[PDB]
Amino acid sequence: QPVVKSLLDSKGIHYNQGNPYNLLTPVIEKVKPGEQSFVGQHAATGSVATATAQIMKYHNYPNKGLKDYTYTLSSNNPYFNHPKNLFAAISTRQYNWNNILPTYSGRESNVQKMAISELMADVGISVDMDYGPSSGSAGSSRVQRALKENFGYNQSVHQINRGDFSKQDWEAQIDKELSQNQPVYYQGVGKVGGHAFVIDGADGRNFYHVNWGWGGVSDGFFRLDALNPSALGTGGGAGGFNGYQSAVVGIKP
């Protein structure tokens, strides 16, 4: 296995889901029974969204959105009535990759914050992101689909299922992407949805550079036997976080 440095790091790409990244997510209007009130709360972008958007930042491909998108909020979302239609004017987006900073500290101006915030909203949207205080999306099917549909990434964008591949041929799909310094959108699905993160490097030992969807927890190498989030406690489907493990590889124009 060849060694690969962190592509996201080589681009000072450090994203989040609540910081100025969720400054454009849809606002919550209802409360979940068995939880606190989240109305008026800026929903999150979603790991899946942030995993893709980071790779979207790594390539800053569409300077303008490629195609308008549209999805109806999930009937499981306890944050809005339900027949809620979300719409991203992506086809009419202005992706200023110079304002969509690769790393936000939450103290930058609003202009650059508006940049990444819309990307996450466009991405989280393009991936039917569930928008609540926590944002759960589907993952690859959404990313690999939105990646080429709304952002038009090279057709090389596709989805693979770790559950259906052999660890060896599975890491091959990743390193191959890393061989060309091309990060991978990865995600281990379970009950809450597909938890995603970005692979942007390798250490020569079946280990890749991963950008979990959290702040600074297990950020560093990827996992081969435990593809779960170190900081559990997301939605209400905790427990067993490997129902559908898959990866989106080949994210580039």
From Swiss-Prot:
Subcellular location: Secreted; Host extracellular space; Host cytoplasm
Induction annotation: Expression is regulated by the CovR-CovS two-component regulatory system.
Reaction(s) this enzyme catalyzes, per UniProt: Preferential cleavage with hydrophobic residues at P2, P1 and P1'
Primary enzyme class: hydrolase
Record EC number: 3.4.22.10
UniProt-annotated site: Cleavage, residues: 5-6
Superkingdom to which the source organism belongs: Bacteria
Region: C-terminal active site loop, residue numbers: 223-245
Outcome reported for the amino acid change (mutating residue 189 to A): Reduces activity 130-fold
Keywords: Autocatalytic cleavage, Host cytoplasm, Hydrolase, Methylation, Protease, Secreted, Signal, Thiol protease, Toxin, Virulence, Zymogen
A GO MF term: toxin activity
GO CC term (a single one): extracellular region
Domain comment, as recorded: The C-terminal active site loop is required for the recognition and recruitment of substrates and release of hydrolyzed products.
Subunit structure: Monomer.
Protein name: Streptopain
Organism: Streptococcus pyogenes serotype M1
Gene behind the chain: speB
Residues of the full protein shown: 146 to 398 of 398
